[PDB]
Amino acid sequence: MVISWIPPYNVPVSFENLEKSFDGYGPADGLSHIAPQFWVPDGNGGISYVTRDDYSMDYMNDDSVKVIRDWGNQYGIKTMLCIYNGEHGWDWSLVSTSISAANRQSFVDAIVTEMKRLNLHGVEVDLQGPNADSPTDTENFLLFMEKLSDTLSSLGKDLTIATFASREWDHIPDASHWPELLPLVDGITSMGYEETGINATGDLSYAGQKSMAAGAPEKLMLGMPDHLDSWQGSSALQQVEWAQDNGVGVALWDMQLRNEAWQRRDIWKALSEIRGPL
Ligand SMILES: CC(=O)N[C@@H]1[C@@H](O)[C@H](O[C@@H]2O[C@H](CO)[C@@H](O[C@@H]3O[C@H](CO)[C@@H](O[C@@H]4O[C@H](CO)[C@@H](O[C@@H]5O[C@H](CO)[C@@H](O[C@@H]6O[C@H](CO)[C@@H](O)[C@H](O)[C@H]6NC(C)=O)[C@H](O)[C@H]5NC(C)=O)[C@H](O)[C@H]4NC(C)=O)[C@H](O)[C@H]3NC(C)=O)[C@H](O)[C@H]2NC(C)=O)[C@@H](CO)O[C@H]1O
Ligand code: NA
Numbered sequence: 001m002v003i004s005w006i007p008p009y010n011v012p013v014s015f016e017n018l019e020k021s022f023d024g025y026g027p028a029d030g031l032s033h034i035a036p037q038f039w040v041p042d043g044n045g046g047i048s049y050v051t052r053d054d055y056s057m058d059y060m061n062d063d064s065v066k067v068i069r070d071w072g073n074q075y076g077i078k079t080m081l082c083i084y085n086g087e088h089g090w091d092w093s094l095v096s097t098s099i100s101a102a103n104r105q106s107f108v109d110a111i112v113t114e115m116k117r118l119n120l121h122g123v124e125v126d127l128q129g130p131n132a133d134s135p136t137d138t139e140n141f142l143l144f145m146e147k148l149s150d151t152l153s154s155l156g157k158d159l160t161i162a163t164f165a166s167r168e169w170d171h172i173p174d175a176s177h178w179p180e181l182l183p184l185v186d187g188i189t190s191m192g193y194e195e196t197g198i199n200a201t202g203d204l205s206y207a208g209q210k211s212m213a214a215g216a217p218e219k220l221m222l223g224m225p226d227h228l229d230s231w232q233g234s235s236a237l238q239q240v241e242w243a244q245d246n247g248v249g250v251a252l253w254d255m256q257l258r259n260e261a262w263q264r265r266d267i268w269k270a271l272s273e274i275r276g277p278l
Contacts, residue, residue, distance in 0.1 A: 001187040002275045003033040004252040011056035014255040023265040028075050030271030035082035035124040041098045045106030065118050076278030078121035085127050092129035099144040108147045122158030133172035142180050149184035158186045165192030175212045182216045189251035193225040197232025198242050206242050221251035229261035236261045240270045
């Protein structure tokens, strides 16, 4: 899989980038999935569009989501409802109350209802709890993911999740949860960015990332940053080439394509080859 995201700020730039062709290759050739990060939990079992008035409020609406969806439908690209908990910083409390026994079914229902309402192709879960794991949070989050997975499966829809890239800390969800998440999802985006690479250390090396996904490495997407042309002692293109040669995917955060290296034909050609035809 090859995924990218549209954050809820600077949206005009991301929208322009969707239609770019860098001398013949661009996002329409490289992505299988596109994820507008436009929704948040309300904390009581429901969901909401982003509402911060200093974000791209002119785009937090159904018509703008359908622009993305219709763009992707031309190519067989899938638009994913991306729900996150970072509107005002990363707030795990919004997730913890959503995945409790009282609200969990309502939360799944609200997510799926919104995806169906807009004729989207699946859900990209981007709910982040830095240093927030506990036994209760692990259980409840995995019960949430299993229920969401079963519901989306019956609808023929895709499910992806973004996680922290390490396992040795107390993050949720992180690579210590991959063995339980892999059977439930179509893809996992490891949010390693400049901390993971060919030459990084241990679990954060790309070999270590793939090893932690050993149950189903074809479902792993290595997270790579649009604002850098290199990290961990390799070029952006080299990092993509490692994914190509080692049977994993790529997750590009994000569609602002801020560094010129991500505005080049070569890297989009490589992503197109990783993706394959749709
Ligand atoms: C201390 C301890 O006890 N243990 C240490 C342990 O914690 C360490 O583990 C590391 O912790 C850090 C900190 O928690 C982790 O860093 C976080 O990682 C996640 C996942 O990568 C990041 O979230 C995703 O990644 C991108 C890139 O950061 C996110 O994009 C950012 O999103 C924010 C919020 O929307 C954007 O901010 C907005 O920016 C606009 C424009 O500038 C501005 O107008 C807005 O006002 C502003 N809004 C807000 C609310 O701030 C920001 O621009 C954007 N960044 C970029 C580059 O585009 C994206 O949303 C997340 N989702 C997806 C999908 O990618 C998270 O952002 C990041 N937190 C911080 C503070 O940077 C780290 O992952 C983790 N590392 C590992 C390996 O586990 C370890 C290791 O260091 O050491 C222990 O000691
Ligand atoms: Na852990």
